[PDB]
Each structure stands twice: as structure tokens, then as C-alpha cells.
Amino acid sequence: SMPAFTINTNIPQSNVSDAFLKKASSTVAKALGKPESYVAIHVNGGQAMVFGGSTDPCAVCVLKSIGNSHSEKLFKLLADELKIPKNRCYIEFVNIDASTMAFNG
Amino acid sequence: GPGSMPAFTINTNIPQSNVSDAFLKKASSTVAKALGKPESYVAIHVNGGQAMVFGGSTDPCAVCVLKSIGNNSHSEKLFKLLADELKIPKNRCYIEFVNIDASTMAFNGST
Amino acid sequence: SMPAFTINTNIPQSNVSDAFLKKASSTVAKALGKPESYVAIHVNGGQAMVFGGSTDPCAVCVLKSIGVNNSHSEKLFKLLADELKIPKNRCYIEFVNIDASTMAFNGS
Ligand code: NA
């Protein structure tokens, strides 16, 4: 399984550097406590988006995993690297197939 | 900090240059009114210029998701938005309404 | 309902041919055993992506259906690798079955 961080933004894609991509990969790997070899990052820039009624710069993101500290770091990463006001960075953390944990004595 | 935002995503093979500022404004308003929510809580994402096949054809189409955390008139209002503003035939528009984490409603007799 | 195969890739969309799209449509229709008229293919190319720490060509995909996958998975991987020229070790596919947790039967 590969945790995946998807960023949808109306920032022009030319403002998304490879340096930012690697920094995001490392941040996500450290946040989830998983090896970077299993992490996928997907930045979809230059999108036509409305966020709260405004088309001003924004980011709508999902961190998807199967089954805290670095999460606020993900917010700062978006705001500082993409130059998006923090109140227009939105992230949904999605844990798929993670409803049940079972223990035997 | 914490808080959910309903989001309408449109995936389409029409060029993104055909996605106007007016259309975005209208889509935000239409979704907000369909959901009965203020526009400040709604997110719109039009992902155009995609390479798509819809029922075996590459003709203009739209595959969409209205996602909420925690719908018939709404569906026709959205289909009208797509067909009238983006000029995608309704028969090549597909919309899924996804309600996340909404399986269980709890009541106490006190309530 | 319409099953949907979504491919997110950093290869440019100019390398995503109509032949590839039609072949992917057919492959999905046969794998899921559903008519091609209900199948959707969506390739989101030219994306800025990192896969396992590298920005080399890669593909992250989801085959979503509402309401077996080992044999068809290899067909989809071969399709990605041969047609889009993405190394198989940098193709990742999630098969997602929505609203399919429970099947109920009466003995009749
Ligand atoms: Na926070």
C-alpha cells in the first residue's frame, strides 16, 4: 500500500518545484512514520477552483492511507511553498479500511 | 482548524480554456443552493483538459463527484449546470453523490 | 453506476493516445464484466508527482466500482507499462469497491 498526498490548487503549476515535491514526500513519510519508498505525492496545479465562494489562491488536499506533529507541518508547507493563505489550505486526512482493530489475548 | 467542506469535482475533457470565471461563480452558487449551505462552506474543482473515455467514446463528457462528510432536484440542477454552461450533453454527464462517515445516526430517548 | 479507471501520471498528456484510451476502456470493461457503455477512463497527465522519493515517470491509479482482480491487475499493469512506457515498478493501482461490504441471502 502507498499513502498518497494529493494537492489540488489554482496556483500555476510552474510554481510547483521538484524541491517542493521532495520536501512534501519527506514530510508525508515522516508524518505517517513510513518509508519514503512507499509514499506518493501528486500536485495538480493550475486548476479552476472555487474555495468558499472565491477563486483566490487555494489548495484542497487529501492525505489517503490504508489503516499530528507533521500534519501542521503539511499545512505550513502548503502555505509557505505555494504562497497560499493558510485559511485557504484544506486537507482531508482519510484512513481507508481502518474501522476495526482486533486483539487476542 | 477542524471543519468539513462539501466539494463538487468535475472531470471533463473539454479544454480548461473553456472554463470561465462566470461558470465557476455559477457552479459555486448552484452547489451551495442545492445543498442549502452558504457558499463559504463549498469547494468547486473543475479538472478540465482531461483525456477521457465515456461509454467507449472520447466525445465531450463529464464525470463528477459531490462529496460531503456527514438528492434528486439537486442532481437535475447540477446536470442543468453542466449541459447549459459547459455544453456537455446530459447523456454524457455522470454524477456520484458520496456521503462519507454517515452510516450511523444515534438517538437517546432524552432527545 | 459507472465503473471508473483513473490514472494520475507525470508523463505529458501528449503521450496519452486515443488508441491507449480505447484499449484501456476495453480492458476495464472485460475485467469487470460490464458493458463498455458504462465504463469511464480518466487519464490526468502532466502532473507534478513524486513516487517513492523519485520524480521519474510513474502512475498512481484507482479502479473504482460500486457493488478476480489479480489476473486483470496484471493486464492493467502491462497496459500501463507497454502503452504509456512507465516501468511496472512505478505503477500503483488501487481496486476500490464502494458500498460492497454486505451480501444478504435467504435460504430459498
Ligand atoms: Na490544524
Author numbering:
A (entry chain C): 0 to 66, 74 to 111
B (entry chain A): -3 to 66, 73 to 113
C (entry chain B): 0 to 66, 72 to 112
Which lines from the publication concern this structure?
O. volvulus and other parasitic nematodes co-evolved with their hosts and are experts at surviving in hostile microenvironments, where they feed on host blood and release molecules such as macrophage migration inhibitory factor (MIF) homologs to evade or suppress host immune responses for several years without killing the host. O. volvulus and many parasitic nematodes secrete MIF homologs to facilitate evasion of the host’s immune system. Parasite MIFs have tautomerase activity and catalyze the keto–enol isomerization of aromatic substrates such as hydroxyphenyl­pyruvate and l-dopachrome methyl ester. OvMIF-1 is a possible drug target.
We report the production, crystallization and 1.9 Å resolution structure of N-terminally hexahistidine-tagged O. volvulus macrophage migration inhibitory factor-1 (His-OvMIF-1). SEC data indicate that the protein purifies as a monomer. There are three His-OvMIF-1 monomers in the asymmetric unit. His-OvMIF-1 has a unique jellyfish-like structure with a prototypical macrophage migration inhibitory factor (MIF) trimer as the ‘head’ and a unique C-terminal ‘tail’. Loop Cys67–Asn71 is disordered in all three monomers, and the N-terminal hexahistidine tag is disordered in all monomers. The carboxyl-terminal residues of His-OvMIF-1 form a long tail instead of folding back to interact with the N-terminus to form the tautomerase cavity. While the proline is conserved in OvMIF-1, its function is physically obscured in His-OvMIF-1 by the additional N-terminal residues. Deleting the residues corresponding to the N-terminal extension in our structure exposes the cavity, and OvMIF-1 appears to possess all of the features necessary for tautomerase activity. Interestingly, the in silico-generated OvMIF-1 cavity appears larger than that observed in hMIFs and easily accommodates furosemide, the selective AceMIF inhibitor.
